Write a protein that binds this DNA or RNA. Structure first.
Lengths: 162, 161
DNA sequence: TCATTTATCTTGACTTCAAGGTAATTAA
DNA sequence: TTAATTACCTTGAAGTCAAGATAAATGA
């Protein structure tokens, strides 16, 4: 049995009038994600990085040289508000990971670009990150990892549709 | 999928790496994020946030008199005690929980559901299930079944370590 | 007793968001 | 030109955590 099976048992005893089967799939998902974050966050700390600081540089890096994106691009992709993004940017700017370049095509726009410092950090952090994930999923058998990828995508399909 | 995009990017920017793991894990992380959004819609109909729901649900599912310890609570909900102290003081102001002094441990102040809280949670969980039932209805039965089975195997490895 | 642990809160700080603000941009 | 919209930041406020503190329970 799994920890989700436990909570279902509790509800099965306390409210037998309900069918809590949906809580099964969804409960496992949230817990998995929660634990998974803990694993990945461990490795990021090895680089003196928090989870969000990594997401920023990975987004800038994966864009492509010159690795320059807009605050709006950033928060639109990272699903955070603008005030959130402002705070993030000022921090990374002080940590010399990003520089601020003024948009020559839109005066209400101040771009964010990777510094040489930041470009090196993320370029090896992405290397560690990948292996960290590879280690985690190695517990699963091939068929299992295969099925999970296929199935989660369908779930993402349905969710993104709505 | 949106994850498919990020994979194409890394395949161009760092072809020296194989980013296959980001696939499964990326979808997982995003799904959880989207799933929370759906659930929070319904919680808002009861004037409740995600954690306020998790709290009363934990107290409710314990069993009458629905009395648990702060340590028990934060241990189950994986949050620090200062988080829990703050949380409890809020719910106490919102008349959902009462504070009972432990007669068996003088360093202990138990947390129990009020008549108010018991009613709110007893119908909120009903809506919550339906919320989830509808969301997952987009998936076929076999697919939802396989996803459940597969997610369970993943939870074993994660919790073991 | 005691030197250590446990239960729980207190403080300072960081991240986040909703709401507002303001300089540019835009289409008529 | 203007009224509406976009880009980005500012400002309170809430939630969270990490140390730290202090009363209470230990087992020797």
């Amino acid at each position: 049995l799994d920890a989700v099976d436990a909570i279902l048992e509790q509800w099965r005893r306390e409210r037998p009038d309900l069918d809590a089967s949906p809580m099964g799939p969804i409960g496992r998902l949230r817990r998995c994600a929660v634990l998974m974050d803990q694993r990945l966050e461990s490795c990021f700390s090895r680089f003196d990085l928090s989870s969000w600081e990594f997401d920023m540089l990975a987004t800038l890096r994966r864009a492509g040289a010159p690795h320059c994106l807009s605050p709006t691009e950033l928060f639109s992709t990272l699903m955070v508000t603008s005030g959130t993004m402002t705070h993030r940017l000022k921090r990374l700017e002080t940590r010399g990971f990003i520089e601020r370049v003024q948009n020559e095509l839109d005066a209400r726009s101040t771009l964010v670009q990777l510094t040489s410092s930041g470009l090196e950090l993320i370029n090896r952090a992405v290397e560690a990150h990948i292996e960290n994930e590879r280690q985690v999923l190695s517990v699963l058998p091939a068929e299992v990892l295969a099925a999970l990828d296929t199935n989660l995508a369908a779930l993402l399909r349905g969710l993104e549709s709505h």
